RNA sequence: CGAGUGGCUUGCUACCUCGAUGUCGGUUCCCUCCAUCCUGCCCGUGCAGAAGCGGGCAAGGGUGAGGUUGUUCGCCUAUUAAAGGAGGUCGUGAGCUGGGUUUAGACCGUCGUGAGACAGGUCGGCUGCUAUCUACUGGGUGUGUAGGUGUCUGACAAGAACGACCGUAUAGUACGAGAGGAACUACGGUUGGUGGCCACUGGUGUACCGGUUGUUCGAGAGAGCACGUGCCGGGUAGCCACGCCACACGGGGUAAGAGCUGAACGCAUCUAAGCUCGAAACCCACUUGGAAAAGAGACACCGCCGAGGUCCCGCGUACAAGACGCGGUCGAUAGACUCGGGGUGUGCGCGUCGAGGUAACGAGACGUUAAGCCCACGAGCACUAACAGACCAA
RNA sequence: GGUCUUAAGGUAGCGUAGUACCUUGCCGCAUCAGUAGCGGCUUGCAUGAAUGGAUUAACCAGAGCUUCACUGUCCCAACGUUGGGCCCGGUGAACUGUACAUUCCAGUGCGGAGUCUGGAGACACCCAGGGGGAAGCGAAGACCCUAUGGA
RNA sequence: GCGAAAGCCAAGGCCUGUCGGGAGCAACCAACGUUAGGGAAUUCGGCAAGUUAGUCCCGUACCUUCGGAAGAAGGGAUGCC
RNA sequence: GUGGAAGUCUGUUAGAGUUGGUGUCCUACAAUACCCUCUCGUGAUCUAUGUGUAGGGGUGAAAGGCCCAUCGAGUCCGGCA
């Protein structure tokens, strides 16, 4: 993928489970995957702060509850590094559900995003009300 | 099914003994290119501290901002070539033919060397050339020796020696190029070799940590859940198979860690000054003050404050070089906090 | 810039941003102030604070 | 239908072992095989492209996480370049586990007149030993080569030190009616592996500073105990990873394969002789070890009445003993002291205030006070201690 | 089959059970995914009434399953504490020992060799280590069979 | 303090749950303290460890042999002067 | 409201016991020990001393348990070489 313009320390495994940060009905995502990667002998597959991951719905409307979902990492709370090397981090853990053009299923995005999220994935970004 | 798992550490830094010369010795020179000149030079190291620098990188999408580096200072005085060696091709390989030395030795030259009283620099000389004529001449190198008394937060007084090859041009001509520098008194500085921007190969006896087991010294697991609690906890589960009968020299076991020849790769120069621009406040922890002649390497350089590091042009560079970065911040900071 | 906690200088690339849930931003200088903070002091309260000071 | 190879399955035999070679599965750690799952390079196609399908060379590297089940196998889920198979006493219990098997207790079904059984199910049920030799990982002392110092050489030896993926430009281009949709090459990044480092972030930090509960020392002050910190908060050095740095390009020779020249065989023919190319594979490049390489090495200088070395002393860039490194007055090596730089968070005492209370009294607040206390770091500084001095030596 | 053996021929209930071989039975619940668990169905290899059947509040260091909370069980290991370990004085055993013994790769051999054969490697001694091998030490195999053995 | 509980302290007893000396004192082991983010992914199985906790007030389901279930659950308070 | 029943609850009170760690130990401190956790603790309770039952016999809330480290038939000597 592009450069993500970040150092991130993966601060979610597989199983994690996180705020949904949209208006979709989903209210808590579990971790199932992470895009692209592939670990190690007894590593727990580790996902972060850019990373594209399948969810499994785990709280939310009926319609949305256990349906598998490919999402987008917004927010963590394990701290990431800038260029400038100031470290940044986040009140929670949250993703955005997104389709196969990675563009989000929901109308509207809650609470803030990270700078270098919003520049990976545009369509997800202008949806965006606070970019930190 | 036992799943597949690459093995605990690198078979290629073996054995993972106490080094025998606490002064690095690169077993690999540069090529020759450029017009003739000494490859390599050395310093002692003094601590970290970072760099906001502009960014230089044109295929960077950050290209002139600012970028925080972190940075290792190294007190880098001027050296002294005190002697030409000249190595014969031989049915063996490389040989020593012999040696030119000088007679402007630095005061405490004698407390590693039986200083030369009487020598004959031309006699030398005319062997060495006549060798040249002949076509049975090899590299030419020259031996090299620090001055620690220049470096105050280095206790060390006796200086440390190392031959450092001279490469570049035509043999005849960096032989004069070499025989130049030698007569002098061989002073030389890190500027005469390298400029700020350029990569270096950094050699050093990393930190020694003594004796250590498997888990820190290969990064093999400790034992997990239940058998981390019978009577095993750092141990490895097993020498070997039944057969072979014997323990293979390849599964990770206890001994010497650290305190071992390293030589790093690629360590981009950020800067090249002499002052006190780059010390820190209240000083480097466990060194003492910079004041003078020192490099600015990018990142880490092998083994603990006070030791000697060597450099040498890079033999096998990833990145073309991006000459005199600009530094906007130096940080001075105290490292206590 | 400025350390919102305490009130010093922080020393550039250095320091850490927490984003709050509202989207706020708060640029600590050290984990000293950031622990102070989560202990729900409040820097004018702490003498050895420049904000105090 | 015919001919074989293997020794992973099963069967057969009874050759070895019954004065015991501990079982299945798993785990951990190491080496290997190729009948190749991915990655590299190729050939064919019912090959437009993209992609499939089949085949060839090839074992460098990789082949991961999870749900049921003791399970192996397998079924299933989401990822992935791919999530290949097998050998090493079905590798691995003087390494682990003990779920299963496989004693003694007990139950159910079935069988038995019964005791009791079952190649069915089920609950419970113990894992000894101070390593002699050998093997290897690291560390020393001697002898050999045959006065000392410093610098090297490089026979050999180890490496995966690097493997893989995503994205961008190429390009909505070639191709194709369209749908769909490449590559050469140049870039940015991720992942797995590898070596190192601590300026940054994070952990620790029974140094330290502070808060505070019970109790004892009459109160105060200042302290002990409450497990080797009573508990709680912060945290320097150092050590660390969750942090940071670095880990090619290019040559040479080949395989499959593409070809050239070219006979045998006037032609043809990539082959028979000769040659041009061509793989992540082989060699070199790079890193690490390496004068005990018995052809036991090379160079320079010093010294044989003295070069160098030992003991001794102050110490760590070193360290389980041993070893290693630095300093020793021609000195800043260690400590004291003073600054600097750091940690904590505002000391004792006194004054004012303080809900009240006749008063006694009074939790606490403010000031003095960027206070007090403390520091495994730095600098200055010969004040103290590196003194005195003993010895070996061509 | 629409009685026959041998007297009767399984009623109420319960049911894939701690009983169901087939079997991971089929449907559903729950999970991303559940040979598990629970509910239902049930032809029950081979349930069933004091060989007690069913059911059941309370109780339980009894067996199985799920959830919330929490956490170094795990990802993936780090730093620290006390006692050992290491060095020095003193004290001072035992296990074990046919012999020889510096081995490694192959082969051979009663087919599972430090000692045989061929090569390779190998200067002597010592310290620390984790235990690959000596089919290591510890017990005249408990399993199986045999004895004109025992209880 | 509810207490013959813990913890601390008297009277009284002891330094004989009887080998010492030394190394910031390494690996490794026994006991144990602290661990960012994730939170059972570990494992046959949450084994081990942890979480909760004393007292008062509010409040408390299915079911039941009407005893019980029940401290269900869940919520709030707690010092000193 | 009183009353204060209970093979009733909590409880390292005394006292009795032992689920798990498959921890420590395993030439032991010990031929059955140590630590934490755990269970019982007004009763079919626990405990001292005295006393009775004896080997094909006792005793057994039954495990072939126990009858002096020995029990699907104690120990000693004899039969016996
Ligand atoms: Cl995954
Ligand atoms: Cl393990
Ligand atoms: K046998
Ligand atoms: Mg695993
Ligand atoms: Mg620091
Ligand atoms: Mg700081
Ligand atoms: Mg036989
Ligand atoms: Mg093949
Ligand atoms: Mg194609
Ligand atoms: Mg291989
Ligand atoms: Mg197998
Ligand atoms: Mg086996
Ligand atoms: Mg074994
Ligand atoms: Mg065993
Ligand atoms: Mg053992
Ligand atoms: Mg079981
Ligand atoms: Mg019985
Ligand atoms: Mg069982
Ligand atoms: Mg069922
Ligand atoms: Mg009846
Ligand atoms: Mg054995
Ligand atoms: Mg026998
Ligand atoms: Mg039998
Ligand atoms: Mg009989
Ligand atoms: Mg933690
Ligand atoms: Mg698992
Ligand atoms: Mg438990
Ligand atoms: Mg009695
Ligand atoms: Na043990
Ligand atoms: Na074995
Ligand atoms: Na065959
Ligand atoms: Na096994
Ligand atoms: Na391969
Ligand atoms: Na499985
Ligand atoms: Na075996
Ligand atoms: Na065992
Ligand atoms: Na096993
Ligand atoms: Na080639
Ligand atoms: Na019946
Ligand atoms: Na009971
Ligand atoms: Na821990
Ligand atoms: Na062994
Ligand atoms: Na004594
Ligand atoms: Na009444
Ligand atoms: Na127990
Ligand atoms: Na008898
Ligand atoms: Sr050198
Ligand atoms: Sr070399
Ligand atoms: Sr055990
Ligand atoms: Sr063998
Ligand atoms: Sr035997
Ligand atoms: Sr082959
Ligand atoms: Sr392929
Ligand atoms: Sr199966
Ligand atoms: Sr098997
Ligand atoms: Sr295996
Ligand atoms: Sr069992
Ligand atoms: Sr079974
Ligand atoms: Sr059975
Ligand atoms: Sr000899
Ligand atoms: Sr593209
Ligand atoms: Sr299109
Ligand atoms: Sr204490
Ligand atoms: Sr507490
Ligand atoms: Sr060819
Ligand atoms: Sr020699
Ligand atoms: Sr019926
Ligand atoms: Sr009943
Ligand atoms: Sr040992
Ligand atoms: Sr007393
Ligand atoms: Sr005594
Ligand atoms: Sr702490
Ligand atoms: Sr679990
Ligand atoms: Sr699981
Ligand atoms: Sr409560
Ligand atoms: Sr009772
Ligand atoms: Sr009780
Ligand atoms: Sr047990
Ligand atoms: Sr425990
Ligand atoms: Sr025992
Ligand atoms: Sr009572
Ligand atoms: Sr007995
Ligand atoms: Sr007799």
């Known amino acids: ?132 | 099914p036992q799943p597949s798992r690459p093995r605990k550490g690198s078979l290629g830094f073996g054995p993972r003994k106490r080094s025998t010369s606490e002064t690095p010795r690169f077993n690999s020179w540069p090529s020759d290119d450029g017009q003739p000149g000494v490859q390599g030079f050395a310093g002692y190291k003094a601590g970290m501290t970072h760099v906001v620098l502009v960014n230089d990188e044109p295929n960077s999408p950050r290209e002139g901002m600012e970028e925080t580096v972190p940075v290792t200072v190294i007190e880098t005085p001027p050296m002294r070539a005190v002697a030409l060696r000249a190595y014969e091709d031989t049915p063996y390989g490389q040989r020593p033919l012999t040696e030119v030395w000088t007679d402007e030795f630095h005061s405490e030259l004698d407390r590693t060397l039986d200083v030369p009283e009487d020598h004959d620099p031309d006699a030398a000389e005319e062997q060495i050339r006549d060798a040249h004529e002949a076509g049975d001449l090899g590299d030419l190198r020259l031996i090299t020796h620090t001055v620690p008394d220049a470096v105050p937060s280095v206790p060390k007084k006796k200086p440390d020696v190392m031959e450092t090859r001279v490469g570049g041009g035509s043999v005849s001509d960096r032989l004069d190029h070499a025989l130049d520098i030698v007569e002098d008194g061989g002073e030389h500085a890190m500027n005469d070799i390298f400029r700020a921007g350029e990569y270096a190969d950094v050699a050093g006896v990393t930190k020694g940590k003594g004796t250590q087991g498997p888990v820190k010294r290969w990064g093999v697991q400790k034992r997990k859940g239940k058998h981390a609690r019978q009577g095993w906890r750092r141990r490895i589960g097993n020498l070997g198979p039944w057969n072979p009968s014997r323990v293979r020299s390849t599964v990770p076991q206890q001994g010497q860690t650290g305190y071992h020849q390293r030589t790093e790769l690629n360590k981009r120069l950020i800067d090249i000054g002499e002052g006190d621009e780059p010390t820190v406040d209240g000083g480097f922890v466990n060194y003492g003050e910079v004041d003078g002649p020192y490099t600015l390497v990018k990142g880490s350089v092998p083994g603990p404050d006070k030791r000697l590091v060597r450099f040498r042009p890079a033999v096998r560079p990833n990145d073309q070089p991006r000459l005199d970065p600009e530094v906007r911040y130096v940080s001075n900071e105290s490292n206590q906090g | 810039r400025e350390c919102d906690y305490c009130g010093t200088d922080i020393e550039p690339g250095t320091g850490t941003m927490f984003v709050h849930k509202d989207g706020a931003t708060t640029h600590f200088c050290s984990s000293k102030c950031e622990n102070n903070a989560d202990l729900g002091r409040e820097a004018r309260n702490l003498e050895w604070t420049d904000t105090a000071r």
Do not use: W
């Open chain 1, 1 to 132: 993928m592009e450069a993500l313009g970040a150092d991130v320390t993966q601060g979610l495994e597989k199983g994690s489970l996180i705020t949904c940060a949209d208006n979709t009905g989903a209210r808590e995502l579990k971790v199932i995957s992470v895009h692209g990667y592939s670990g190690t002998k007894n590593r727990l597959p580790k996902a972060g702060l850019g990373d594209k991951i399948t969810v499994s719905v785990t709280k939310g409307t009926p319609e949305m509850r256990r349906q598998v979902l490919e999402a987008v990492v917004v927010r963590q709370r394990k701290p990431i590094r800038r260029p400038d090397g100031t470290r940044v981090k986040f009140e929670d853990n949250a993703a955005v559900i997104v389709d196969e053009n990675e563009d989000p299923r929901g109308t509207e995005l809650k609470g803030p995003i990270a700078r270098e999220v919003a520049q990976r994935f545009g369509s997800v970004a202008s949806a965006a009300t606070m970019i930190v």
